[PDB]
Design a protein around this ligand. Structure first.
Ligand SMILES: O=c1ccn([C@@H]2O[C@H](COP(=O)(O)OP(=O)(O)O)[C@@H](O)[C@H]2O)c(=O)[nH]1
Ligand SMILES: O=c1ccn([C@@H]2O[C@H](COP(=O)(O)OP(=O)(O)O)[C@@H](O)[C@H]2O)c(=O)[nH]1
Lengths: 450, 450
């Protein structure tokens, strides 16, 4: 059969564009032609990521200036929350450029997420569509689904956000009372329409729903979504990029080598999150309390001159060589693979979650966003491969709760540590077995053909 | 099941508002609540048509004055072609009042045709929409459809207008040669946008397409439109208003009784058309040529003192009592049912088309507008229940051509006459069968519930 030509049109945020590029590389690796339509700044930012330049082509789309849009703003990273609606309205206004490009490109299949109008173009130009979602299936399933009723005129109440929709498959993968605000985005105003109206049309318009997940983790959610929207659900798999090769930085390798195997606690909260100073101080003190060696790589809190200035007084001298607090970017995958590292404290962001699952380190989760919480519930509560830190009203976490969670996994005495480790081993050796990722890619491509 | 609440917002023309009222009367008969939004002058003209005042409510919308709009102009009837764009801009400018009214009415379903912005209000307020078209499916299918490409700049050449879209279901229901201009409206500027842009958004925005037609006549057209737009198509049926059950004027009953049964040729061209004097004279001369009794009810040409003054010299003396030319409105349906009448010459306007099909009279068609031509092609060529008069460059028809058409159906010898009568009898027996109209309405309502 001939290779497919697929055009991708993602929402204008780095967190959306990058996974599409990851999918595009896996598809082009199998010989399909991919055209990706993105703003100029994102292309300059992410242009090196193209691994198959003959097959993968970038086409620049101009972001129209509209009332309220800051000058030079093309992506979600450029704007603060005040400009949310104008960016969305600017995103909707590139309909007519996208129509012009698609007429020339003539793709077999178009991938989109937030552009609910693309199916209108599918009927006009004649192409199939996949609604491809980088975020968790549970988020979609618990949030914007026909079973849940969302009022047009008023926001959802906290109890409405807390209560899962009728037929929702899990009692475990649920939000609590204080975490409801994390789901309030589903009904938020997003340009001309509210977000749930936009997503509902995107899901109903597509030929198929695409989810960046695997059945073993999220099978019940995908079926619920398939029943709810009466659409086939295609699972690409996680589509994890090849993790960085080359030697780990020698200073870190030397410092880690001072410690015993599996004895070091590594902490990182992804590339986006920046903690507030009081939470930052509370976190480092929690690590100090454990008495174990710790390596924490975190951005300094906003407006702080340095990591040291943000630190609580006397912290450095007491810790000595036990711990490192580092303001810079680090080779996370190489550090996790180091023999000295035995525990990973993360926010359960998508990349960190999969790296934790693939690693042999103990998993401790401090989620902030709604997906991180739901994925934390899956890992800690449903699968019991991890423990979750208890958290306060704003998501705030105390040093005692963080210390107790780390100790619960790290001590050889602790029964919970043995239990999560045994469960973690069983999932890992499913997840790392040869062909597991590739089977998802192949079946996904085969589903595109249907 | 609970009754539906339906709001109708038709384009500001009497020819659009009245059929919407016809559907509204039929829907209210089955207990649904209808709110109809129209300008004040249209309400005074059409208010008596409301048969179910508890269920059907009129809400007045003010037509804003905008640059170039004639004073007091609220409908297409008020304005000449010079004001076409100002009327459209005024129609589009009543967006704010319609939005305010829709917030108050809170309808389940909204019916619209030219108001392409209505689906945007649907997304904001939360209602389903039907794009309801009084004009025939064939006109929609041949004209503004994704398969046809219309430049947003230059106009569609006569050969482009002549050529039907790719996949168009009929070879027969097509425009010929100099008729191409009759379709030129599809690309015309209509206020801020060109007409095909407005209709394309309206068709793509709706939840379903509604057509005032039946599957038996126009089924392939409806399917083509459904495939082209990837939308459900709902067939209301013709929704014919009940004929005015009144005694026929005695003078006409007496004059018709002078002649033999099925021997009289009746001619009328609808409620809108006014012939030019030269075409008017050519028409009456064609009737005289036939030698048959004739009754033609036509408006006198614009600016003419009387029908008699417009007549070619000597016409009334030669015809005597054989024929009548009447400048006034007549009871068309009762005259058709009179036993003396055997033939109906019409312009194939929508009402005259259905009345001819339901009658036992022979059908002779002289179409002027694009919908009238396509429906003439369906009746005369596709089904062969009628004959068509040949027409000249401007739609002009010669008196010799009209005489030959009438003689082809009226002469008992004519093989063509026997054929159209038999075919007409077959269709009439289907069309008048009990429950035929009501089944379409009931199925239409059931589709609305969906
Ligand atoms: O110091 C750091 C922090 C993060 N990451 C990488 O950043 C990626 C994205 O983080 P994740 O998806 O876990 O969370 P997010 O960045 O989306 O908030 C992961 O693959 C991590 O390996 C890294 O290499 N070094
Ligand atoms: O002298 C006349 C002319 C017309 N009609 C009626 O006017 C209606 C509208 O005509 P049609 O829809 O055929 O053409 P249009 O008015 O749309 O051009 C038809 O139902 C005719 O029966 C009538 O009763 N008397």
């Amino acid at each position: 059969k001939p290779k497919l030509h697929i055009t991708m049109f993602p929402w204008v945020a780095i967190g959306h564009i990058t996974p599409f590029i990851h999918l595009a590389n896996e598809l082009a690796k199998r010989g399909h032609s991919i055209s990706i339509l993105i703003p100029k700044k994102a292309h300059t930012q992410l242009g090196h990521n193209n691994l198959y330049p003959d097959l993968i082509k970038f086409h620049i789309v101009t972001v129209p200036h509209v009332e309220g849009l800051p000058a030079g703003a093309e992506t979600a990273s450029d704007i603060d929350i005040t400009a949310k609606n104008p960016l969305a309205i600017a995103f909707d206004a590139m309909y007519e450029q996208v129509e012009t490009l698609l007429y020339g490109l003539k793709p077999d299949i178009v991938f989109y997420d937030f552009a609910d109008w693309i199916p209108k173009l599918a009927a006009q130009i004649g192409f199939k569509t996949v609604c491809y979602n980088v975020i968790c299936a549970s988020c979609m399933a618990i949030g914007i689904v026909p079973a849940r009723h969302i009022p047009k005129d008023r926001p959802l109440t906290e109890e409405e956000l807390m209560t899962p929709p009728e037929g929702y498959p899990s009692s475990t993968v649920v939000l609590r009372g204080q975490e409801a605000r994390t789901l309030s985005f589903i009904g938020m105003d997003y340009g001309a329409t509210k977000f749930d109206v936009r997503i509902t049309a995107a899901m109903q318009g597509c030929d198929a729903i695409g989810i960046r997940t695997c059945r073993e983790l999220e099978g019940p959610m995908c079926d619920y979504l398939s029943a709810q929207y009466n659409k086939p659900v295609f699972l690409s798999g996680p589509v994890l990029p090849e993790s960085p090769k080359g030697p780990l930085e020698e200073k870190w390798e030397k410092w880690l080598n001072k410690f015993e195997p599996k004895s070091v606690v590594y902490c990182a909260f992804g590339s986006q999150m920046i903690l507030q100073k009081n939470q930052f101080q509370e976190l480092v003190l929690g690590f100090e309390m454990t008495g174990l060696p710790f390596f924490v790589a975190l951005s300094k809190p906003h407006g702080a001159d340095s990591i040291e200035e943000a630190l609580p007084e006397g912290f450095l001298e007491r810790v000595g060589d036990r711990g490192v607090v580092h303001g810079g970017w680090v080779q996370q995958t190489q550090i996790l693979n180091h023999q000295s590292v035995g525990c990973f404290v993360s926010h359960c962001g998508f990349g960190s979650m999969w790296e934790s699952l693939l690693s042999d380190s103990q998993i401790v989760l401090v989620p902030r966003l709604a997906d991180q919480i739901l994925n934390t519930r899956l890992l800690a509560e449903e699968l019991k491969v991890a423990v979750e830190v208890e958290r306060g009203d704003m998501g705030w976490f105390s040093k005692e709760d963080l210390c107790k969670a780390i100790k619960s996994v790290m001590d050889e005495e602790s029964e919970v540590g043995k239990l999560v480790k045994k469960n973690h081993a069983k999932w890992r050796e499913t997840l790392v077995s040869p062909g597991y990722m590739d089977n998802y890619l192949e079946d996904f491509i085969q589903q595109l053909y249907g």
